[PDB]
Amino acid sequence: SNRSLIVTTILEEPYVLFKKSDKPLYGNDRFEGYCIDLLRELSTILGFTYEIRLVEDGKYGAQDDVNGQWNGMVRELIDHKADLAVAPLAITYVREKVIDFSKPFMTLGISILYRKPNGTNPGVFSFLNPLSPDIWMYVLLACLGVSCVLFVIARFSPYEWYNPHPCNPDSDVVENNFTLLNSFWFGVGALMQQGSELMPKALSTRIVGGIWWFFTLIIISSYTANLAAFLTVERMESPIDSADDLAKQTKIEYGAVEDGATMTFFKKSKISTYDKMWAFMSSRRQSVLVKSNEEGIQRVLTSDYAFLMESTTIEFVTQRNCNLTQIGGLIDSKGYGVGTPMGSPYRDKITIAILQLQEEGKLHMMKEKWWRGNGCPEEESKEASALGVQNIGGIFIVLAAGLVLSVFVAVGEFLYKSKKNAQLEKRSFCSAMVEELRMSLKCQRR
Amino acid sequence: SNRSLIVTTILEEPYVLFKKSDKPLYGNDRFEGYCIDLLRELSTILGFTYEIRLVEDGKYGAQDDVNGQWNGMVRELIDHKADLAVAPLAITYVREKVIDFSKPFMTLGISILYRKPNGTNPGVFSFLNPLSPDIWMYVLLACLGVSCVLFVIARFSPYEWYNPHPCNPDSDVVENNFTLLNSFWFGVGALMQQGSELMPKALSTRIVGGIWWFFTLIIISSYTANLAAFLTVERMESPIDSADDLAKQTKIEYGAVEDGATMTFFKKSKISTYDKMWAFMSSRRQSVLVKSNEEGIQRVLTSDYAFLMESTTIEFVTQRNCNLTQIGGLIDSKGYGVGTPMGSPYRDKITIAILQLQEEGKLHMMKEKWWRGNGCPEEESKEASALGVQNIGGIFIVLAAGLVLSVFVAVGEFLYKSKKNAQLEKRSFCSAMVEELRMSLKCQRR
Amino acid sequence: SNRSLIVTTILEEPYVLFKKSDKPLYGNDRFEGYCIDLLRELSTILGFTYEIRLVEDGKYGAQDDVNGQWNGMVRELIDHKADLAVAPLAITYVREKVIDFSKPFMTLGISILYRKPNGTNPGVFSFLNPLSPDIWMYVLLACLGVSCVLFVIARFSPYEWYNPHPCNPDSDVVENNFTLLNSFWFGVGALMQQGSELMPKALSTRIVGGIWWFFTLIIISSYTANLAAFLTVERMESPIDSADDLAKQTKIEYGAVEDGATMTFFKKSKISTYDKMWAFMSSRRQSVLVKSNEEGIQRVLTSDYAFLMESTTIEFVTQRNCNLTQIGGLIDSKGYGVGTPMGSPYRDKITIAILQLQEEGKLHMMKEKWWRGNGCPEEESKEASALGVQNIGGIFIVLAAGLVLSVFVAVGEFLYKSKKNAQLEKRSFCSAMVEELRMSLKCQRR
Amino acid sequence: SNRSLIVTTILEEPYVLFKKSDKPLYGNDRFEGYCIDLLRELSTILGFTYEIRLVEDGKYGAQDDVNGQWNGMVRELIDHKADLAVAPLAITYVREKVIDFSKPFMTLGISILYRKPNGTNPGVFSFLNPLSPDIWMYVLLACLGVSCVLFVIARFSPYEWYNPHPCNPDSDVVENNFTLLNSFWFGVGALMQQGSELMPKALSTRIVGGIWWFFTLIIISSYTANLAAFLTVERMESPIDSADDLAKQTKIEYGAVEDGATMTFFKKSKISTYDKMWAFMSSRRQSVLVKSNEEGIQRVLTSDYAFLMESTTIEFVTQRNCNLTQIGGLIDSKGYGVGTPMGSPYRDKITIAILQLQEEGKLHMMKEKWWRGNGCPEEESKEASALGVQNIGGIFIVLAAGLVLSVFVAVGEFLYKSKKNAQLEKRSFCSAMVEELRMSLKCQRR
Numbered sequence A, B, C, D: 001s002n003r004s005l006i007v008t009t010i011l012e013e014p015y016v017l018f019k020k021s022d023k024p025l026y027g028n029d030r031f032e033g034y035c036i037d038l039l040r041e042l043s044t045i046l047g048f049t050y051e052i053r054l055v056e057d058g059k060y061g062a063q064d065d066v067n068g069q070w071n072g073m074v075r076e077l078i079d080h081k082a083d084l085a086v087a088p089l090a091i092t093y094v095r096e097k098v099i100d101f102s103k104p105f106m107t108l109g110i111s112i113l114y115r116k117p118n119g120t121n122p123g124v125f126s127f128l129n130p131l132s133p134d135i136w137m138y139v140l141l142a143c144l145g146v147s148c149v150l151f152v153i154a155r156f157s158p159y160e161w162y163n164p165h166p167c168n169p170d171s172d173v174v175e176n177n178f179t180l181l182n183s184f185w186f187g188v189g190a191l192m193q194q195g196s197e198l199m200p201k202a203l204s205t206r207i208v209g210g211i212w213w214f215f216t217l218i219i220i221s222s223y224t225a226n227l228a229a230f231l232t233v234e235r236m237e238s239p240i241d242s243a244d245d246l247a248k249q250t251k252i253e254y255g256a257v258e259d260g261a262t263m264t265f266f267k268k269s270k271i272s273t274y275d276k277m278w279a280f281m282s283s284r285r286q287s288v289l290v291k292s293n294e295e296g297i298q299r300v301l302t303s304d305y306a307f308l309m310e311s312t313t314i315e316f317v318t319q320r321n322c323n324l325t326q327i328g329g330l331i332d333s334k335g336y337g338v339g340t341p342m343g344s345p346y347r348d349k350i351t352i353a354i355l356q357l358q359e360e361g362k363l364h365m366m367k368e369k370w371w372r373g374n375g376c377p378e379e380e381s382k383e384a385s386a387l388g389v390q391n392i393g394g395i396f397i398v399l400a401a402g403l404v405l406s407v408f409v410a411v412g413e414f415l416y417k418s419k420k421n422a423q424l425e426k427r428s429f430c431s432a433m434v435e436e437l438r439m440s441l442k443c444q445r446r
């Protein structure tokens, strides 16, 4: 029938926390958190009766050097007003001089919080990138230009008018093949490297086709080479994953809680990587050292802000917000711990207790309960450097647009020929219906 | 001041090891390492003197299960024949109930050692990789697609029905050279940049040949550019990435030291992933359970294998050798700690001391000394080996597959004709040997 | 201990500057910088106290040439109204004959500031760059070469003399389709990957068409690959690289502060390079001689210009701005030094002191503090802009040049034929207008 | 008529040095060096008479901490046995406590010495690199393989034997064009992307040509892509130019003089770059810290040795040996100086003198005299990333080899046809001479 114990906690999340319910009448039934699950299991295997009681200051603990005294939870331990400190109260060199701890039950770390890479969004015309929109207009102007020149040269040049029926010699007919329609077909035929028939014959037309070929060879070998340059630097581009990789940047900005434990590390740092990281912060001590963790989250979502905090509070917000991530490893290495008054007969019986809960694996079950929650749809890390339908893609759009464009021209040829010969003969339909049957007659004659 | 301290320590890799020098007589300088460098600052802040001994029955410590009867270092700390036991000694619930520990000075867990992804077996069909397998299906649906629309328009257009036989004008003959067979041949011919022997007249089927040419120019330039992106910046990856990925597969096989801290972890575990992993090792004992750490690396380094040791021992071996890396995060969490006999006041003194050295970062500065090294910086400079049969051997397979497909068609064409030669009032079997002599007639006439 | 020391100092960029904060009243904290950070370790080793004043007539110091009558800081050190004069004061023969100096704590010389090579005007004929201009000459000597050897073998081979007119066999007709004109056309046709309408039979001219095809496949694949190498990793360079390179040119124009240490250097020089450079500036005074340092950067940053100041002032400006760099090595060599009145024993004390701070590297640690910064790390990540008229505008020039060349040939072919129409017993002038009506006859017959 | 002065020097080069001549009888006419040119000009403008006298120890100066005394030149200054120290005696913190200096007359620096990049030597067949020598054998085996298959299929397939004289209908002849000679010409014609006539007609031969086209498209797009990978990483490869860039390496090894002033800098270094540089040296204190400068030069020429010394002695050996260079800037910053006894009336009159020689520019003339010598043919920094005749080059060898091979085949066709018809007719020569005339008859008939 010993005295019940009096623990002092602080309202952090997923740490101790009011039970979300109506009908208010509660003793120790107010609080519902990670540590209240921890205080329950430590009470079972040691056999004591706790009585939770919040801290009055609302602070962890610090030493006002002017007064030379303490505040917060750690003052309640010194004056023996409480005797347990089940809390996120970390382990520092200044605290252990005054009060006594147990062994750690969670491992902290400093790590970088930052927005996920949102995506690419190439737009499904990305094949059209490696030349300027001036060049794609000028090439199409050149192919209409050179075709209109080649039609004019093939009229005037007398060596072009050769003899048709080349297999039937000794007649009197001449015919050049470069009409207006075929002259575009030589230009388009040479532009897409496929060649054509009706090659130029006279030397005045050999020069035009001889120099248009050299125009196509430089364009297509430039489009192939430049598209290799886009796809090389995209795979060669890597997202940042370090503190040192984020140290070299200047466009992406740092951040911390004002006069917290994170700022304390960088002023006392001696690493050359971390030394310049304090130099960028102290240069900008108006816009990145914001106030606290709650304002540090909001600045990441609305900027290029790369806030730094402890590794636990990263792992709770990345599970509750799938926009965010945990770039980088662990900078520092700290730990939590149940605190006790100086020289008390409980720093051992909790040290025994925390290890026994570790052997049975309960601390990992208590962490996966509270820190995972409403399981994220996360994965979606496609990033596949292989041309899908997000990229090239739209070449099938202009392909299908061309084939539909052809069918309206095919109706145009079908109507124009059917109304041409019908002005010589039978009126409209008995000329048109017999052409559809002559089409539908599968025999290769008529 | 009083008499010196007998620091009982075991000898391992980079904590305590002999000097490699001359004059083999030294005494009290016979051991050096990280753990020895820890003691040099331990005697600086807290004043004491050394008599570093090595344990005569060198082990860490365990039960007897028949006499209780501890071994290793911690057997010496009970009988007070020793002192502070600064070593790679791990905090465990069984050990803490007997002697004492300080608060930990190094964190560690269980993680996975595995061969680094090499990239010298990419698969024999590696050339498909620059395009997504949707697009390889889509260009066949395009090439079979456009050829069918080419066949419809070529019969629908009246200007395609042209006059053959230019040696003989003024006839009734008419050809429509695009069959169903030739229409696929124009599409396949333009797809492979080789042209064809026929070509569209009659403008409504010029657009189809026009827009299909521009389709093939973008695809082949996209295939050439993206294949140039692969051979410039290679990006290899591991098959398995976490313990959950390694739990599912059975191609790679697992590994753990028998009767060690790792094997006893999975026997006591109750996670559904790890209980599957212990169900593996219990079945295949004496084949995957190594008997020592050094034999365990050789199982990775020779065979296809995965190994599970403590994370600090991984972080040294992966700096020495470049063949192998660490896969995944830390599974468990335990700590190394300074041993101390039960009730000695040096426990609380070193606990203050280790937190002091943490604040300047002397622990981190010493860990950089005794785990860094060569660094394996050869993940650069991209040697760019020549293409060979390891990479593009797949096209020699699909070349021979086409020719074997061709002979089955060539027999099918030979047997189809003799059926219609049997339609001309002959024997089907006799007319086969008649035509086979005509192939072997070998003259180029009739 | 005695009274304090009146440290007379001028105010400049990053040596001594005001604080940017609130509470404008401070006193003895009103100045901070590199040179102020030097004094903090100067009072640490050698004990003294501060009364930092600023010089009322702020200059460094020079003659009067009419009254002698020094100015600046060193006028105060003569009359003993001052003390140690730690500042950007330079050791010079005229100054050392009057007061004293310590041994120098910073080395510096005269070097050249200039615009960074940008790379946004590569030249309009930039596509010639992947091949050497020997090879562009060599493929024309090959294409004119192989076509001539094609013409010889085609007449030398009896199997090329084949039978034309396949509609009519059993004749005496024979063609040799390779003329001199067609032989160049086959070479140009195979060079531009377009094929031709004629093709060799007769095996001895198949090898020529065989080996020329393999010649063109290697060249065009080499042009495409090397052009892809340029657009991936750009490598810009400066026009001038040293003072000797800048001495020869007259396109870029020089620059120096009037009546400064730089302008007085070149007037006294006797090196043949620099005497040419002073012959430039004496001719073009009031156009290239700036009147202040800050106006001198603006001449570089706006116009095409080169500037010559001290090397330390360059090394700060090039860290702040990214538009401009340093070109070449140091020309002169001078030093900064702590001033001291004539005969004061503080000269030899600081001389010991500066050598002390050099040994730990406190000078180098402070110089990293007050000259580094943003660093301009943007010489990475290779934005890979699209090809445009700045880069491949040259082929539109050589396209239009070919067509204007074509019309002069087309007139030459039209006038050549009417000469032989005048050979058929007609007027040369009258038969021209007869044939010009036949082009304008516009019917496709006779 | 004051006393003549007694200077003590040491036999360094280009410092004081015996005059290379016979007929030995010399006073102060022995020595002939940089400093003897310096001692001459200081004697003129101050008006004293020197008397040179070498040091007896042969050492610069050092403090044996066991004895607590000095040696070398600096002991001769303390005991007043000499009174000048015109030498390469540097300025250190330990020397200036005991003796007094003048201002520096030369600026040292620590810099890295290393072998020049010897070259590339691609071998002029470098186009043949991006495929393995197995692939270039297998492609040539495939083109002989597929051609021999296509000849066999075109014999058996009855749809291949179409009608010749296609312009002359209604005859009875059949003729397939796929002979043995044309079947190779289809394979070679499709291999180099140029196409051909005599396209396959029956579906059994459409499959062979349909799948050989896909074989060529993968090969040529692989050869283009892989050659881009070679030429990208060659431009992306950069030679080392830093100390930090050489810090990351492990294949290229460091080096220093045993217990010299260079080793003194790295043990007292605090830069994280330089700290690991001492870690690599102290790990290998048997093979890189060789003995001295004379053995340090020989190790660079015969290894991958990257020796470190002062900046002056680099600049003398790189002018006398064009194999070597001065990679990197200046690590440290030191200086030389005329030394004097402690508190002597000459540390000022030399300080005045050295500046007056600096204003007239004589120290730069005295440096360009002795440190340049037998002016190097240096420049040869072509390194032009543009395909010259060192690269591709050899495609002109196989081009010229093919054209010479053709002419021996052309004689073979000319002899075989001339001896074929002559067995029907006229004996040998009057058939052969009339074919040469029929060749030489320029008319296109016969």
Ligand SMILES: CCCCCCCC/C=C\CCCCCCCC(=O)O[C@@H](COC(=O)CCCCCCCCCCCCCCC)COP(=O)([O-])OCC[N+](C)(C)C
Binding pocket: B442, B443, B444, C206, C207, C210, C211, D152, D155, D179, D180, D181, D184, D185, D188
């Ligand atoms: C860069 C390189 C590009 C260029 C490529 C260069 C590469 C060069 C590589 C090689 C070049 C070799 C040239 C070929 C020489 C032959 C000559 C010829 O063709 O004409 C001849 C046709 O003879 C024939 O070849 C066709 C025969 C028709 C039917 C035969 C059926 C075979 C049976 C199926 C077998 C199935 C059994 C096996 C299956 C398991 C006729 O003309 P002739 O010669 O005047 O007449 C000779 C008459 N005599 C023969 C009686 C004397």
Ligand SMILES: CCCCCCCC/C=C\CCCCCCCC(=O)O[C@@H](COC(=O)CCCCCCCCCCCCCCC)COP(=O)([O-])OCC[N+](C)(C)C
Binding pocket: A210, A211, A214, A217, C122, C123, C124, C125, C126, C128, C133, C136, C137, C139, C140, C188, C191, C219, C220, C223, C398
């Ligand atoms: C794969 C295709 C193979 C075929 C090859 C055929 C092309 C080979 C022919 C010629 C190339 C050889 C000349 C290049 C020499 C250096 C360039 C130069 O100095 O440019 C200068 C002159 O500006 C120009 O006028 C450009 C150079 C001539 C190109 C104009 C003719 C194009 C060919 C028309 C017919 C084509 C069709 C012909 C066949 C039907 C200025 O430019 P830049 O910015 O100062 O350049 C820097 C170079 N530099 C550092 C040395 C100064």
Ligand SMILES: CCCCCCCC/C=C\CCCCCCCC(=O)O[C@@H](COC(=O)CCCCCCCCCCCCCCC)COP(=O)([O-])OCC[N+](C)(C)C
Binding pocket: A155, A179, A180, A181, A184, A185, A188, B206, B207, B210, B211, C439, C440, C442, C443, C444
């Ligand atoms: C992806 C896309 C690829 C495909 C490309 C698609 C792109 C499409 C773009 C364009 C397509 C447009 C088609 C053209 C329509 C014409 C029809 C035709 O050709 O036949 C006609 C030939 O008429 C001629 O055009 C040739 C006449 C020859 C002599 C004329 C010389 C001109 C004088 C020099 C001038 C110098 C002065 C200026 C100098 C500064 C005849 O056939 P018909 O029509 O039955 O008869 C009509 C008779 N009527 C006219 C009396 C009614």
Ligand SMILES: CC(C)CCC[C@@H](C)[C@H]1CC[C@H]2[C@@H]3CC=C4C[C@@H](O)CC[C@]4(C)[C@H]3CC[C@]12C
Binding pocket: A181, A408, A409, A410, A411, A412, A413, A416, B159, B202, B203, B204
């Ligand atoms: C579909 C709408 C826009 C109408 C298009 C009309 C086009 C397709 C028609 C109208 C007149 C036609 C031309 C009339 C006569 C000839 C001469 C013949 O020897 C070849 C075809 C050719 C050259 C035709 C080509 C197609 C043509 C240009």
Ligand SMILES: O=S1(=O)NCN(C2CC2)c2ccc(F)cc21
Binding pocket: A091, A104, A106, A107, A108, A333, A334, A335, A336, B103, B104, B105, B106, B107, B354, B355, B358, B363
């Ligand atoms: O409170 S501690 O025992 N002392 C400091 N350490 C170390 C990083 C070594 C750590 C690291 C992680 C912890 F959880 C606790 C501690």
Ligand SMILES: O=S1(=O)NCN(C2CC2)c2ccc(F)cc21
Binding pocket: A103, A104, A105, A106, A107, A354, A355, A358, A363, B091, B092, B104, B106, B107, B108, B333, B334, B335, B336
């Ligand atoms: O042996 S401990 O003091 N107690 C158990 N824990 C925890 C896993 C929470 C840890 C975690 C890391 C350590 F370094 C030590 C310990």
Ligand SMILES: O=S1(=O)NCN(C2CC2)c2ccc(F)cc21
Binding pocket: C091, C092, C104, C106, C107, C108, C333, C334, C335, C336, D103, D104, D105, D106, D107, D354, D355, D358, D363
């Ligand atoms: O003011 S000095 O002591 N005298 C002149 N010298 C020398 C050029 C040798 C130098 C060179 C660099 C300095 F920093 C100082 C001096």
Ligand SMILES: O=S1(=O)NCN(C2CC2)c2ccc(F)cc21
Binding pocket: C103, C104, C105, C106, C107, C354, C355, C358, C363, D091, D104, D106, D107, D108, D333, D334, D335, D336
């Ligand atoms: O003998 S010193 O005046 N003291 C040290 N300094 C340096 C600040 C680097 C230098 C640098 C170059 C010198 F030539 C002399 C000196």
Ligand SMILES: *[C@@H]1O[C@H](CO)[C@@H](O)[C@H](O)[C@H]1NC(C)=O
Binding pocket: D117, D118, D119
């Ligand atoms: C340069 O030539 C020397 C002399 O044999 C040779 O040892 C060295 O390897 C060459 N350099 C390179 C980079 O191959």
